[PDB]
Every structure is written in C-alpha cells, then in structure tokens.
C-alpha cells in the first residue's frame with residue numbers, strides 16, 4: 001500500500017537544475033477525520049525526528065539553509081505528487097535522498113527502498129546568443145543559459161570583444177544587448193561570460 005515511483009539515479013551539471021518526477025501512495029480510508037498530509041525529502045541516513053529537511057510542505061519544519069530555494073516540491077502533494085525540483089545544482093548536493101510521508105498518528109513512512117541518487121557533474125554547457133546583421137540596424141542580442149533556473153541568486157554577465165566601443169562602454173552587463181553593428185566590426189570575436197554571483201560563449205560577427 002506504500003508505493004513510491006521515482007527513477008533511482010539523476011544527473012545535473014553544477015549550476016543548472018533538473019526536475020525529478022515523483023509519485024507516491026499510502027493507505028488512507030478517506031473519511032472526514034482529515035489530518036494534514038506532510039511529506040519530506042531527507043539526506044540519506046538522517047533521522048526524520050531530528051533532521052532539517054532538504055524539502056517539505058510542513059510549514060513548521062525547518063529546511064536546510066543549503067537547500068532553501070534550490071530544492072522545491074512541485075505539484076500538489078495532495079495529489080500523489082512528490083516531484084522534486086533541484087536548482088542551481090552544487091557538487092555538495094551529490095548523494096542519496098529519501099522521501100517520507102506522515103498523516104495522522106497512523107501514517108508515517110520513509111521510502112528507504114526507493115532512495116534517490118543524485119550526481120552533480122561539472123558545467124560543460126555554454127551560454128547562448130539568440131537573423132539580421134545589417135550595417136546600421138538596431139539588432140538586439142540575448143545571452144542566456146540552457147538548463148538554468150531562477151532558483152539560486154541571479155546570474156552575472158559581462159561581454160567581451162573589440163566591437164564593444166561603438167556604443168555605451170558600460171551598458172554591457174544586461175542579459176540582452178541592443179547594438180547597431182558599425183561597419184569596421186566584422187568577423188570580430190564576441191564573448192559573453194557568466195557567473196552565479198566562469199564559463200563563456202564566443203561567436204564571430206558578420207556584417208552585410
């Protein structure tokens with residue numbers, strides 16, 4: 001009667017985020033005596049009674065400062081959803097995790113058989129720049145990053161290149177950038193670095 005559906009292993013590139021689909025079941029008669037349903041995710045081998053949860057829907061339970069905001073329960077727990085969302089992954093997050101349910105004095109249960117193994121790989125993904133290119137046009141660029149979440153603390157950008165003097169010599173921190181390619185700027189390496197408060201992406205210009 002106590003079942004938990006979730007993949008056993010999961011991978012995420014440090015700094016990015018992933019969504020761990022999860023579903024769970026437990027015996028519940030369903031009559032009006034309806035005490036609240038509290039679920040938790042813990043680090044492997046911790047004791048429910050004394051541990052700060054990595055994630056929970058219990059308003060009284062203290063959450064690990066390290067996971068506050070990065071690990072969040074998605075979906076309605078009242079609808080069998082234990083889906084987890086890990087954001088701004090960190091190497092420290094690597095390890096095993098388990099889910100627990102509690103409802104009334106009777107329902108209490110840790111799914112120690114269905115642990116969740118999380119491996120935090122290194123960040124190899126490169127930012128992105130998203131077809132004009134006319135000498136004298138107000139083209140606007142945008143340097144974002146795939147697999148990113150607005151989980152942790154906002155990212156920081158800084159553009160590099162020789163073609164950064166035609167206009168503002170300081171308004172180049174924004175994610176998006178407006179620029180009118182002045183002629184001389186052709187086949188010039190344009191870069192965009194990023195940090196989470198340092199990977200980059202270099203592209204070659206082309207004016208016509």
Ligand SMILES: CC(=O)N[C@H]1[C@H]([C@H](O)[C@H](O)CO)O[C@@](O)(C(=O)O)C[C@@H]1O
Pocket residue numbers: 048108109110111112113
């Ligand atoms: C009897 C029951 O349904 N739940 C029991 C659970 C689960 O059997 C295990 O966590 C499964 O791994 O174990 C406990 O130690 C717990 O964590 O509270 C006692 C609790 O009564």
